Amino acid sequence: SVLTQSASVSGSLGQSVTISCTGPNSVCCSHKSISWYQWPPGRAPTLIIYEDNERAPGISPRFSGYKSYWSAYLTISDLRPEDETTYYCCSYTHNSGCVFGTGTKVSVLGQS
Amino acid sequence: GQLVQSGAELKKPGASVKISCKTSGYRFNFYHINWIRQTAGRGPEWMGWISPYSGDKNLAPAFQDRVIMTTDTEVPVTSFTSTGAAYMEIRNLKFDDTGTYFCAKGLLRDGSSTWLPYLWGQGTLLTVS
Numbered sequence: 001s002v003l004t005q006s007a008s009v010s011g012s013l014g015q016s017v018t019i020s021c022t023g024p025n026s027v028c029c030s031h032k033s034i035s036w037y038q039w040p041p042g043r044a045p046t047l048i049i050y051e052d053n054e055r056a057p058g059i060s061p062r063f064s065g066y067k068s069y070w071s072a073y074l075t076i077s078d079l080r081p082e083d084e085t086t087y088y089c090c091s092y093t094h095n096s097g098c099v100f101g102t103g104t105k106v107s108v109l110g111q112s
Numbered sequence: 113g114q115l116v117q118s119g120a121e122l123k124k125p126g127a128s129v130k131i132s133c134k135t136s137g138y139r140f141n142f143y144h145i146n147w148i149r150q151t152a153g154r155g156p157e158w159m160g161w162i163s164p165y166s167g168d169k170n171l172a173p174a175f176q177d178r179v180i181m182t183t184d185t186e187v188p189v190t191s192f193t194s195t196g197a198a199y200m201e202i203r204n205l206k207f208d209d210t211g212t213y214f215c216a217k218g219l220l221r222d223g224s225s226t227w228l229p230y231l232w233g234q235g236t237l238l239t240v241s
């Protein structure tokens with residue numbers, strides 16, 4: 001698609017992991033807001049961060065994020081088994097629809 | 113908000129299908145109805161951001177003219193917690209227009225993040241076959 005990710009990231013239980021989103025100038029981080037969504041396969045999405053760093057209601061403080069001129073980042077502290085699901089980031093403006101990128105899977109290491 | 117999808121359809125190429133979701137427990141006219149699909153061979157594609165209060169619609173260039181979006185008048189069951197429904201018709205379905213379709217309630221009424229999907233329904237299956 002237009003908005004792309006690394007496709008696969010990983011990290012150990014209890015540690016931090018970073019997921020990044022990049023793309024062409026038409027999806028440049030300097031003009032459009034980046035949202036993040038948990039999207040397990042076969043189940044409804046859950047909103048995580050509506051705007052680069054604004055945490056959605058009910059989301060534990062271990063989820064946070066930041067943005068750079070050329071990229072957007074979601075930081076997940078203290079990975080848990082339920083965090084294995086694929087996460088997606090879609091960019092948007094107040095007067096245009098959110099455009100969805102590719103997903104990133106998370107491998108949570110050290111499980112029984 | 114208990115956004116509930118009416119159900120799945122199993123259509124043939126060239127048919128028209130109306131996909132609908134119902135609400136219960138929030139003010140229908142306060143938030144947008146977001147139509148989004150997840151396709152097995154592509155993943156989430158998005159479809160459109162339709163307002164139930166006004167006639168304003170924001171439709172992806174990919175789907176202009178193909179799909180007609182509309183909402184129903186809300187039913188005031190109780191103040192601040194109304195019911196209602198919205199639906200869209202997708203014309204001239206292709207083999208690519210398969211997979212799982214979702215309805216979603218908008219996050220906020222104002223601010224830079226308004227119209228953004230927040231509360232997602234259960235979803236329905238479309239086989240186009």
Ligand SMILES: *[C@@H]1O[C@H](CO)[C@@H](O[C@@H]2O[C@H](CO)[C@@H](O[C@@H]3O[C@H](CO[C@H]4O[C@H](CO)[C@@H](O)[C@H](O)[C@@H]4O)[C@@H](O)[C@H](O[C@H]4O[C@H](CO)[C@@H](O)[C@H](O)[C@@H]4O)[C@@H]3O)[C@H](O)[C@H]2NC(C)=O)[C@H](O)[C@H]1NC(C)=O
Pocket residue numbers: 094095096097141142143144163164165166168169170221222223224225226
């Ligand atoms: C009764 O309640 C209804 C429903 O809640 C209110 O309608 C909402 O009102 C808010 C505030 O006005 C709306 O938010 C605004 O959305 C605009 C998008 O609409 C324009 O652009 C799209 C293009 O995608 C067109 O389709 C559409 O026709 C419009 O032309 C934003 O552009 C607005 O942005 C404002 O704020 C940002 C910062 O946050 C600034 O950058 C902008 O310059 C601008 O000032 C704004 O976000 C919301 O969309 C409406 N929701 C619905 C469901 O309709 C009514 O306003 C309210 N009635 C009264 C009298 O208060």
Ligand SMILES: *[C@@H]1O[C@H](CO[C@@H]2O[C@@H](C)[C@@H](O)[C@@H](O)[C@@H]2O)[C@@H](O[C@@H]2O[C@H](CO)[C@@H](O)[C@H](O)[C@H]2NC(C)=O)[C@H](O)[C@H]1NC(C)=O
Pocket residue numbers: 057113138192219220231
């Ligand atoms: C935006 O508001 C709606 C509507 O609830 C409003 O806020 C509540 C805290 C309360 O003051 C209500 O009277 C207001 O109308 C939120 O939707 C749900 O509201 C109910 C109210 O009983 C609440 O218990 C639920 O947890 C709310 N959430 C869901 C998912 O149903 C909505 O969550 C608010 N959005 C944000 C981003 O905060």
